[PDB]
Design a protein around this ligand. Sequence first.
Ligand SMILES: [Zn+2]
Length: 24
Amino acid sequence: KLXXAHXXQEAXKLXXAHXXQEAX
Ligand SMILES: [Zn+2]
């Protein structure tokens, strides 16, 4: 939820609830 380039995870651009990581 906080962005941070999804911690480097390209998949984050598609959501998927960040794999459960609130940090997204
Ligand atoms: Zn993410």
